[PDB]
Amino acid sequence: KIVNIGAVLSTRKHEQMFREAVNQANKRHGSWKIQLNATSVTHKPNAIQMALSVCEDLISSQVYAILVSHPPTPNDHFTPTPVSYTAGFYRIPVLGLTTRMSIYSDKSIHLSFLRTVPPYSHQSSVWFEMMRVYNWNHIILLVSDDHEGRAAQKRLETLLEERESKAEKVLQFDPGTKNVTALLMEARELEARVIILSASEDDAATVYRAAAMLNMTGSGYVWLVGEREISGNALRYAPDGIIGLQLINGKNESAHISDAVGVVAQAVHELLEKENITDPPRGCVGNTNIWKTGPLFKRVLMSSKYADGVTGRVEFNEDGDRKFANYSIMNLQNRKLVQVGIYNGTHVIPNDRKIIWPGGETEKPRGYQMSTRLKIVTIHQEPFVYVKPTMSDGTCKEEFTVNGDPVKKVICTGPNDTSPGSPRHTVPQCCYGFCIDLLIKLARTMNFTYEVHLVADGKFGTQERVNNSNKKEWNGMMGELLSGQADMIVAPLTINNERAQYIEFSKPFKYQGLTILVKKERITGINDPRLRNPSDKFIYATVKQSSVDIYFRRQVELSTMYRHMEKHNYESAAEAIQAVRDNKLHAFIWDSAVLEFEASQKCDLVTTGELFFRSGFGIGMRKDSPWKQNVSLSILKSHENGFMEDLDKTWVR
Template sequence: MKPRGIQWYSTLPSIKIALIIWTLCIEPCKNKEQLTMGIVVPSDFFMKRTTNAKIFEKKNGIASIDDDDFRLALSRYRFDITRLELKAISKTAGYSPWDILDVICEKIMTNKWNTVLYANYNEEFNAASVQYLLSLLSFMGIPTIVWVPFKSGLAENPSESLNLQLTPSVYHIDAALLKLMNHYSWSRFSIITTNIPGNAELVATMRRMIKTEFEGREYVLLDSVKIWNAQNSAEVYEQLKVIKDSDARIIVLYASRAEAIEIMQAAQSETLNIATDEYLWIVTHQAVLFDEEQRLEFPVGMLGLTFGEDDTLWDRPTFFSAIEIGMDVWLEGIKQFILANPDPARANSTNPPSLVPNFSCEPNQTAYWADGQILYKYMQGVNLSDKNIQFKPDGTLKEFAFKVMNFNKDHIWKSVGVFDADGLKLDDISWPGDAATPPRDRPEKYHLKVVTLEEPPYVTYSDLDPRTWKCNPGASLCRMKPLNITQQYSFENATRNSTLYRCCSGFCIDLLNLLAEKMGFDYELYVVEDRKWGAPDSKDENGKPMWNGLVKDLMDHKADMCMTSLKINPERSSVISFSVPFLETGITIVVAVREGAISPKAFLEPFDIKSWLLILLAAIQVVAVSVFLFEWGSPYGFNRQKRPVTRDESHGRKSDSKHHQHRFSLFRSFWLIWAMLFGAAVNVDNPRGVSSRFMANIWALFAVVFLASYTANLAAFMIAKEEYYDLKGIQDPMLHNPFAVNPAFKFATVNSGATSINLKKNYPNMYSYMQQWNKVNAAEGTQAVKDKKIDAFIYDATVLEYRASHDEGCKLKTVGNWYAMTGYGVSFPKDSKYVDTVNEHLLQLIQRGDLERLQKYWLAGACKKNNQRGVSSHPLKIVNFTSAYILLAGGILLGALLLLMEHVYFKCFRPKLRKWDKCGCCGLISLSMGKSLTFEQSVMETLDLTKNYKCKNPICETQRWKVQHELDLALLKIERLHMRLRTHGFEIQEKAVWRDNRPKAITFREEPDVCNMPRKRKNFKQQASQDKPSYDVHKENKEFPLANDKTHIVPASRPSSTPEQEHKPKTSPSFWKSKKKDKDKSATPSPQPYRSKTPPPPYNAVDPKNKTRHLGGRQYSGVRSDPPIDHLEMETVL
């Protein structure tokens, strides 16, 4: 048993045969719809009969199609293949709108035409009416196939049109023309068009194609002339004169046959004479004439482009071949449509596409066939490879073949080549004048006289090479004297005389050489005799201005062209002609740059005033106060007290020291911040607190950034600044009122130049003042500025910019805004024929960037201050440090002022401030101020100095220990004497000696807190009897009253004293004297000594428990035989 799939495929042929039988036998019995294509041809009986024969042949060919799939699909659409009808109209579609509408309603809509083929070989038909018909058909949605050989641009409509063009488009014509010109290396040409369809498109397409360098060659369209009415001979002559005045030698004519005859007759006239051997005319297919009488009007050697099967005329085979191709395109489009939609019943849409239009001329019926665009797309995609028919998206052919025709000396158009997809193939051609070679695309070289004048960098003079007596490459020989003088010598001898001939080079000379190459001319270059630019210097008898210089030579036609930096202005433009500007310029001012003195505030100039105020008056103050406040609030610093805490106190232990080693205040915070800012190597007191130290580190980071930025920019300001007159422009007050300064401000310009003309016209007072200093040229003017003969020089901006940038030593500088903006132009005699050609070439050079390259080469540059190689700087002089010396001198004066203020403070303000500052708050601000207000602070400072003193050799240490030992023995002896005196009842005067438990010092105890003392103090004796103060060295009585109001002395204390007893005043001889005087004045009785019941240990006994030594009741640490001073102790002295 066979598989089911094989059984299915085996039954397919029988099913297909059944469907074909149904299609051929049963289905034709039903009513079928007709597919109709209308053909519009000229009103010609023979053409109508032949066209009907072609239609009948095509119908028979359609009936004999053996494509089963196509016939099956066609039957499903209910189309009768045997009744497929093609209708023809023997009309030109009418010449009036009514005739066109009548054809549309009676023929096209009534017969349901789904495509129209319009073919017309007649040259004289009304193109506007045909254009109107094609537009209406596209509006109705009916595809149109067009064949109009004489109106190539007729069917080239916008993208929404439904036209398929069988004739060549303007793109094909332009491509064939450029291919032909490229074959003979022609790159310069002109186009003449008339008002036939496609004339504007032809020129626009040509410009677009040459812009992209078609076939790798650069083309130049010199002129594009349009003749609206070729029957008007005046208009024809006027437009052709433009061609004559140009350099065009290759001329393309796009016109009809009748128009071409009129144009060629005018071109061959004696007035124009532009059909000679130097000119070559190329006509398009519309103007190729085959009539014997008419073609005699054409010159020998013309070239033409045409197409067709016969070389003699627009033959009938070509016409009927076009109709046959149109029908093939339509039939192939129908076939593709049906095969793409084989079964309309199964279409997804409720309204499947139809090949039969449903429009009508009735008012209530639609006049648009939407499915026509679908049919147009299928027809557009047709590819008839055997006939080379394939369309582009715009409806034109992708490729088209042209024949190249040549009008030979027998006055016959002969085919000499073909242009198709394979390229251009040519045979021998008869050229104009029976020449053996093709003509050039430009005229033979002509000679021009060019006048110039020196103006670096535009024109620069140099001597000839003494070896060859020729100019170097890029330079041109220029005559320096009039021709009547140079003709007295032979050319060889004249060139060796530098007063007669020199070499000219520069921007304008390079531009002149480019124009000579592009335009094909030779030139003779000479310098104007009076060496002036050109300005009216006098008037003739009729009151007209008489010019001089370059302008005069052009007005007198001594020169054909002027090439130099001649500025364009209205006065010159009225008497000579200028090209488009090749470089913009204006008027500016140049002044001299002189070395000036360094600013006294140069050290401040790296930052502006706002930055300095922010750093000095804000940042430093805020950071210094912040560091002090953080330290004052830190438990490791002040702990919000008036004095710093000791290290024991910061760790929660009782302090065993009477002195505070940490020193810090607000002013010391400022000192720290300033020292860190400038990295000064000075002694500073650092904070203890974590927050204050962190803030100091942040400030150190800021200082690094600040110093790096400051030093990086300081060098630029420590050099001598350049001084110059910073004028704002031509409107600067110093120019309009030069006597406002002393001496008067002097400035100048060049006589007979554009600048002098402008100033004379707009600023007559300024011009009359500056005339006494005017110069001959710009070189003299800039040198006068450098020599201080004048203060400023006014001239062309680009010239002064060049001179300033190339000045030796950079002593020139342009200032102010440019004024009177204009440009340099190539100048000619009035109404010269070369102006338009030069303009065109200049625009091309500007567009290609050639002028920009010349400008960068000649105008760019930077002056060099140092001409010696290897030397980049000079030693610094004292003048470079003027500001630093001023800063140092200012610091010395400020220090002297501060010293004076210190003396004023100590003599005038300290006593008042001491009475006011009872709590010692000034010590928080400044330690020096606090010490100056209290005696205790001064003594403590001396004790600290003594404490921190260390011997630097053993001898010093031995002597110091010996003196200390003798002092201890003396004090011990005094103590025993006091005890004996008290035993015997002697009364002892109160004098106190303090001994410090710290070695190397004898100090006073610090004053008690006056702010915390009781207002009423008890009697000394009552206090002694009640409290029984002890002189035992192992105890401390904090409440012991003082005998002196000025310097208070309190009993001794043990080493484990409170933190308030850390600092003790140091003894001095003056102190004892003061105490003695105070004692005599005081009447307070001395307290009685207290005797301890426990006898003191023997002298020099060692305690075995703690290894301490006892000296007369005093305990010393260690095992040293000679004890140091142990602790503070008060004894009375006789």
């Protein structure tokens, strides 16, 4: 039983190393009557003629596997593809020795393909490790629009989902296009200072020069790149201090040849010990069937641990890519690529030298640049945020408390009255109350200035699916905060599970629940028979697109009440309270604090039943906000000493 192996190499001397390696494997693994034969051909310029020569020289023989190298002249995925098709028709495994493209790891296209060197997509994983080492959470991902960039982005995002984190934003730029500065401009406006680039060498050079022109290479910024962006024309224009990484062997053709021959020999011996091995087709012409053993040979080849390689342990993952590779972390110090670590498959260990960050800093830079100007969206809630017209000269009227102390007020910008009568301009008005005083104390404590504006549509926020939409999106304050119009929500925003998935909440600054307001006390909460038996006689509803609507929608037992309420929901709390007082609405379901304050101050109305959904109000911020901890600590301290009690006495007695 003679076993024949084939190879497509470049220099015709690599063929001699291939023959020497096959001789070594044939002696180390007992020859007996196994006789591992070796045949080889050289790469050809024309791809079609290369495929035809693959049929005529290698497939014509009883080849069990084909090795394929990469010519020194850069042609990217062009050169190893033809073999992968011709050998892929018959399910003959083909091992790439130096190819790095991610398209060859897609087993639906390149069926019988394996590789001894990981693709570029795996450079994301090592990046992830650094994000764990230096605790970087807010990152920008600058990937090219080609398939390789998309693969890198997908791999990094999948890694981040396990950690349950997210990239700040992803910027896909068309390959080979100039003036990507516009995209970079967006990266400048973000709060993240870490940029992870995945592009070709020319695109890397373009991005480097554009970032240099925009002062993105200064202090506080961190650049993470792969080997494509720190070699060739990219290295010359690379800004100082960037961190790239290189595979240890990478371009060592001979080491990969030896390792591949070793793994192939081991797999061949195992396969012939398995019996029922049939025979390769012996010629492309005539034979139109796949090789029956092919899938079994590939399955044996993938499940192989050749822990004797020149390049270390040789093992494959679920799609043939080399698992557990070694990377060297390189830092550009004074126009020299100094090695400042090694990624040994699972961790990165710093060994020598000192990391020089792009701004010349000698200390680890944080991955964010929290601003001082804070755009704060707020809503008009009667005991928390009073909104009043300002006087003719553009300043708030001086007013003193009943105790005799000045009332702090802020200048908000809101939509004057409802939409039809509005002149459609953000008129400046005067905002004050519980939440405004809390915000003033919080800004004084945390040392940040602010500008306050009202929510455009006057809704707290919910998820809705408009017809002919590909996805649902938050409206109101939640949509404003998620879209970026606001940086922080200072309003009676209820904390619930639906909002918490997309939004970070501070520790509650006020505990309350849900209650029912009625005119003139004949309802026993939401367990009352009339509540569960709706009729046209009894009308009850809440404010549209609020926490109460979310609460009622998510309960199957309350579905009929949800339908009845939805048929008559109101636009705002004040309108529904007025409707209740005007005998137009019988019961109003809302927050305990607002409803209790309304009943106490206005009289003529009473709250009924016990609180049936206890929660609290919290300051809403974007996910993984750097100062979420500081806001929570400040709120806890305010609760502890006296501040919340003082606010309660002053505003809502």
